Amino acid sequence: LITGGAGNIGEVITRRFLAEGATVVITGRNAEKLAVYRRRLIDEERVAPERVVALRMDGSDIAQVRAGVAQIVHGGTDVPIPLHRIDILVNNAGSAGPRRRLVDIPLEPSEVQPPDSETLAQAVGNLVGITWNLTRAAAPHMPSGSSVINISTIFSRTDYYGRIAYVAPKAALNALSDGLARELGVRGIRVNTIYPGPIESERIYTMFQAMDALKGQPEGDTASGFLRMMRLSRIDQNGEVVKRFPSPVDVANTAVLLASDESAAFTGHAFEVTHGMEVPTESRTTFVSRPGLRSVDATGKVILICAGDQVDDAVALADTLRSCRATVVIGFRDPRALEKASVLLREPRHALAADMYGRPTMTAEARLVRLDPLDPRAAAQTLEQIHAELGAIHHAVVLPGQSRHAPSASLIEVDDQVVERFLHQELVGTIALARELARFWEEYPSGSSMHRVLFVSNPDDQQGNQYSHILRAAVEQLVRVWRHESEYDSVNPAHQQEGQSSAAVWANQLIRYVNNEMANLDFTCAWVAKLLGSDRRIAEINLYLPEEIVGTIGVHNPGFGWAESLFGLHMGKVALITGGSAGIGGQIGRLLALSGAHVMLAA
Amino acid sequence: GNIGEVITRRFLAEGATVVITGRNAEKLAVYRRRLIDEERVAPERVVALRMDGSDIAQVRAGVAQIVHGGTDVPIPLHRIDILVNNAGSAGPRRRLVDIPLEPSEVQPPDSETLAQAVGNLVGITWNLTRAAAPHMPSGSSVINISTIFSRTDYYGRIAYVAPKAALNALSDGLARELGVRGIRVNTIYPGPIESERIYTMFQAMDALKGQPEGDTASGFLRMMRLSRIDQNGEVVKRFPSPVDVANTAVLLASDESAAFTGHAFEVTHGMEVPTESRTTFVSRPGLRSVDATGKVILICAGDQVDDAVALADTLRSCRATVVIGFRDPRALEKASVLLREPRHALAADMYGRPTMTAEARLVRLDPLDPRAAAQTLEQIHAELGAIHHAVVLPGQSRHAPSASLIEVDDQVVERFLHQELVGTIALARELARFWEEYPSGSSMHRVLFVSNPDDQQGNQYSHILRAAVEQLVRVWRHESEYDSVNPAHQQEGQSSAAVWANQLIRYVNNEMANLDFTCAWVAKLLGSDRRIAEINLYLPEEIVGTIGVHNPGFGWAESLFGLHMGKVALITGGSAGIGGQIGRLLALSGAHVMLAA
């Protein structure tokens, strides 16, 4: 019925489902010691024992009980009800996690504080891993026309200061439901993705007072910002333009219908119970044009290309960045990839020169360092060592760790090894790398220009690109929060850099798993170079690229700044060329035709 | 139809009241009643009224008052009522070039003229919305059923998509406005019935398209999920069901789901389709590759003298002749006086060099009035030849003096819905016929649909026109491309060409360069070979904010970009004269300069 049956919204919903049935399988807490007597007396009120199953099932984060049914398929606590199939299942997590900035998130258990609950890996698990493993558990079971219900925060699209550990895994259940609807609907199972809104009470009020005290703004700033966002006015206790926040009664009212037969039509339905809100649920901008790269001037800057295992595109991306006449430091996650990349880069065509326009440049040779977000202290020491070697680090392209995740696209019948590799190494790994970058930005001296961190995604796998999909969707909210919450910190008296001056961060994420051409690699790197080396600020988080090689506009840019400078010079002027079939004449005719004139080649 | 029957059947009980209203042909209640009362329940709750077909504001208000007062039996008291907007007609099934503008063109399939087709279930819905302004009890609800094809490319039903669209924009504006009182409008998408009529209709469409049988239905059976239980396993794509969507919609209308306001009711069983095909301008286009030497651009202008003349200047800067047609009278002479001045009477290209391009002609066009616009189209044909580039601007600058939608009582919105939506549809066919009646082998046909600018209080009407345009462009582009290969229509004269249209929304940017950015985007999608795969285009909320570029015809400085990059230069006496200009162009090139004087 409801995963969060222990002191959770679902534990409250247990008061329902009894008028037309009975509330059963109320999952208990992890401790399971005081949970046996917890809410047992409350549940016994106005409800006979009957077959109501209030067993304190262990909501384990890891899959040690995944094979175990515990009222799923067979066995059970005391009755054979696991043999029966329950028509509903809820993927609620109910773990807020730590509430801190991007400099001091508790990555390891030694870094935890009493205000903190769990660690970074635990925090990511408590919101993604339980969802995924409970989805896999008892997959062939449940009725042929059952229902699957999710619950996520409505802040998964709105900015949320100091809650990256909350939203970064909370921006992943929606993506996973999106990717799983297509591959699950076959058997005839729907995924009702319903988001109950914040409940109006004194707790959220005090939360917001603490919130705007932390950000450093006058009282009621966040309250005004989230009240003006409201477009509808409630009719509770009549009145006019009350504009009260959403109530849990409406949450129960919109949740109970999933058990009824009327829900059979819905599938993949965004069902945000927040009433009358306008947010751009998805932020994107398909590239209409092809960027001009001969106005970047990235010289005098260091670009740490944090590549995990996909160094194949990295070496080329590093060379393209070198073409901007910029020094680069290529960082590697896997150990053996370092040797292969060194061998590949030693050969010319990768370490040749900083070839830009129609001319070369020495610039600096591409360095080679080993990094790993799994170990915090080693990665921080390596970053400090790079600081001592060169100085500050501002431009940092961030690529995922492993290339082409998993051998198969299926996400139902899979062993947990690859899935647990995807978590704790791509989500947690990238969050850890962002943590180290933010530590370097804050606790170490930097400049005044804004800080750029691109988040290029995995390429096309000729299949369902869900493994790049989760990466993109979990990166979107992360970069959005990192962008918005790092502006108040640059002016507040709390964080004045110990009297020094610093800058905020602006971070997009390119998406290239939608094109399937051969020039898409040059296209993405071009966009990467333009977003790093130039001055520009796009207000959209995610950036999408066209569905064709050239897409809307047909341009190829093989270092042809001259042909770009010669555009439209002699427009609409017929030209006659004698002997223009070999030598200087052919070249003059070709450059004139590229200019725009009309040419008549005679030989 | 069937969904209305099921809704009325569910009304028979559960503490509900049934009202079979909205009679057709001004008298249909007698033809459609007394069958709901045939059930044991509701001995008197069954109510039928012979309301006017057009349902103007005053007659709608009278009908509402007589319903509140009942059939003289109950005390007069306004209360809740049925506000579902399911009442409507399909309209003509005419093809992409032929259209019933005048009533004389009535056909057995086309029982309604263009204006009547537009008002079938759009104008009447808006008028009923206005007539339900004064007294709607708190906690009520109202929906506007739209078709699921309001985003999917269609064929032969431009009159069932262009007016069937913009209901979303009207609902958006009404949700923003009327939400203060505590009322809601949510778009609802009941799917096609799994009946034999819809099955044979698909077969007819396949035959009409000139394609092998089954591919049109394959487009629905391929990119649509199943996620159903019917027939136990192996539930093949059978399209959504009407009874389920009707029952769920009326359950939303009842309690247990109050104040949802998070429902689009897009019941297509998956069917991944964007809610709006659009992109953002994160870069400024480079107008250097634009070429229109041998091309004629006719600007379908209106009373907007300033904007149309600016567009004419920015297109004539691409060495092209123009024909500026103005919709309303008494504006031709002002345009002539303004254009007489040398500011707009001289054409200079993007480098700042004057060009001896043909001057700006001036004609008079009357979209809403057929047989005269076509005559003028043929006249300008005889004058110049075929015309392919048609920038279509709206009728009036500000569609209403007050930025509101429900306070009015059908006085100016009639002019809007009759001369700026229908007007556009009439002009679109006027142009389509010129292109198809006279086939011309060339590139695809380009029809931009620039929207009006923003001054204050946003642009609710612009939103409406945008929603109607996106679909008109989408459905058209599809039909055109499909009909470019059919030998049936190919034999008419010579070989023709397809059409590719777009939109260039501007009502979101409020700056000083939004009337120059718009000129750049109109001149880039016409004078170049760039096929946007997305329908609606949108300006950035901040021009200098995302990409600040200033282009007063300065293509030289654009050509001199990144030449001497990362070099330090020392200049002597570089404060005024030749050396100052060398320093200026070198700094624009990318080098580092050190001015000393």
Author numbering:
A (entry chain B): 13 to 615
B (entry chain A): 19 to 615
What does the paper say about this structure?
Malonyl-CoA reductase (MCR) is a NADPH-dependent bi-functional enzyme that performs alcohol dehydrogenase and aldehyde dehydrogenase (CoA-acylating) activities in the N- and C-terminal fragments, respectively. It catalyzes the two-step reduction of malonyl-CoA to 3-hydroxypropionate (3-HP), a key reaction in the autotrophic CO2 fixation cycles of Chloroflexaceae green non-sulfur bacteria and the archaea Crenarchaeota. In contrast, green non-sulfur bacteria, including members of the genera Chloroflexus and Roseiflexus, employ a single bi-functional MCR to catalyze both reduction reactions of malonyl-CoA. Full-length RfxMCR was a homodimer of two cross-interlocked subunits, each containing four tandemly arranged short-chain dehydrogenase/reductase (SDR) domains.
For the first time, we here determined the cryo-electron microscopy (EM) structure of the full-length MCR from Roseiflexus castenholzii (RfxMCR), which shares 58% sequence identity with CfxMCR, at 3.35 Å resolution. To investigate the dimer structure, RfxMCR was imaged on a 300 kV Titan Krios cryo-EM with a K3 Summit direct electron detector (Gatan) in counting mode. From 4,647 micrographs, 4,043,667 particles were selected and used to construct an electron potential map with an average resolution of 3.35 Å. The overall structure of RfxMCR was a homodimer of two cross-interlocked subunits with the N- and C-terminal ends assembled in the same direction; the dimensions were 160 × 110 × 95 Å. The ED (Gly783–Arg932), which comprised eight α-helices, was inserted into the SDR3 domains (Gly573–Glu782 and Met933–Gly962) and was exposed at the two sides of the homodimer. From the full-length RfxMCR structure, we first resolved the conformation of RfxMCR-N and RfxMCR-C connecting region, which was folded into an α-helix (G573WAESL578). In the center of the homodimer, two of these α-helices were anti-parallel arranged in the reverse direction. Instead, it plays an important role in connecting the RfxMCR-N and RfxMCR-C fragments and also serves as a point of intersection for the two subunits to form a dimer. Actually, the dimer interface was formed by symmetrically distributed hydrogen bonding interactions between amino acid residues from the RfxMCR-N (SDR1–SDR2) and RfxMCR-C (SDR3–ED–SDR4) of the two subunits. We did not resolve any densities of substrate or cofactor from the cryo-EM maps of full-length RfxMCR incubated with NADP+ or malonyl-CoA.
